[PDB]
Design an enzyme around this catalytic site. Structure first.
Site, short mmCIF file in Angstrom:
data_model
loop_
_atom_site.label_atom_id
_atom_site.label_comp_id
_atom_site.label_asym_id
_atom_site.label_seq_id
_atom_site.Cartn_x
_atom_site.Cartn_y
_atom_site.Cartn_z
N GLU A 36 0.86 -1.17 0.00
CA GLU A 36 0.00 0.00 0.00
C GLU A 36 0.90 1.22 0.00
OE1 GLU A 36 -4.02 -1.28 2.53
OE2 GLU A 36 -2.67 0.32 3.24
N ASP A 47 -6.71 8.95 9.36
CA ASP A 47 -5.58 8.18 9.83
C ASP A 47 -5.24 8.39 11.29
OD1 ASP A 47 -4.71 8.52 6.61
OD2 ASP A 47 -4.15 6.60 7.51
#
Length: 244
Positions: A36, A47
């Site tokens: 990723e 996040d």
């Protein structure tokens, strides 16, 4: 998109610089089932603390959207490991969806995850991704109801990414519950981004059905401290989480 039991490294593009990112990717490839690559964004509100800090670093150091394709393109000359570009919608939106996707495909990207893709745009987005040859990866968290997991699984062509903004150092019950519900609903394979940090986490999650385990927090952490020289420590970390 990856073999069952895959360890999936997550790295932020341009943290601390594009050459470093490339160096890290090349050094971890041998243990990756897939990778990723996150595009840093000014407001990575989805996040956790650690990864957010990497977005800030990358940006302060002058990261430019397309430097991500430079990294993927360079990486592709050495490996064919599946790559999933992770990003917020703003960058894609401004540069033009199809233009971005086409360019992503050309660089070697296999799939993409738009963390905050507005549902209003979801449909056309998946259609363009299909036409451009890019697979879709959608996100789900502990607060995602079974009904939406179903809808998410139906749009997904790559794999379903399950996340837990909980942290820990132990995997929360709430995250395990998310996985259980996902395995009971998804036809697509699932990866788990529960911020693992111990060998037992990996084994436990695979044992519990996660087709692949993402490992970003633990890596980005070392990168925040070591900078360009994190390379060797990153390999030791992955070997630890793999029992080798």
């Amino acid at each position: 998109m990856f073999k069952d039991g895959s360890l999936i490294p997550y790295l932020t593009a341009g943290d601390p610089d594009k050459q470093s990112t490339l160096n890290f990717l090349l050094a971890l490839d041998e243990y990756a089932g897939a990778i990723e690559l996150g595009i840093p964004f000014s407001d990575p509100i989805a996040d956790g603390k650690t990864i957010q800090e990497s977005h800030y670093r990358a940006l302060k150091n002058g990261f430019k959207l397309r430097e991500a394709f430079w990294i993927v393109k360079a990486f592709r000359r050495h490996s064919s490991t599946p790559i999933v570009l992770m990003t917020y919608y703003n960058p894609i939106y401004r540069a033009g969806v199809r233009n971005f996707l086409a360019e992503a495909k050309a660089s070697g990207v296999d799939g993409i995850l738009v963390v905050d893709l507005p549902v209003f745009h979801a449909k056309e987005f998946t259609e363009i991704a299909r036409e451009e040859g890019i697979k879709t990866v959608f996100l789900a968290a502990p607060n995602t109801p079974d009904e939406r997991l179903k809808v998410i699984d139906d749009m997904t062509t790559g794999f379903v990414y399950l996340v837990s903004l909980y942290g820990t150092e132990e995997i929360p019950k709430t995250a395990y519950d998310l996985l259980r519900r996902a395995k009971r609903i998804c036809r697509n394979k699932v990866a788990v981004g529960f911020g693992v940090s111990k060998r037992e986490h990996v084994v436990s999650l695979l044992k519990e059905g996660a087709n692949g385990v993402v490992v970003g927090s633990a890596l980005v952490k070392i990168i925040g401290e070591k900078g360009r020289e994190a390379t060797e420590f990153l390999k030791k970390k992955v070997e630890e989480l793999l029992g080798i």
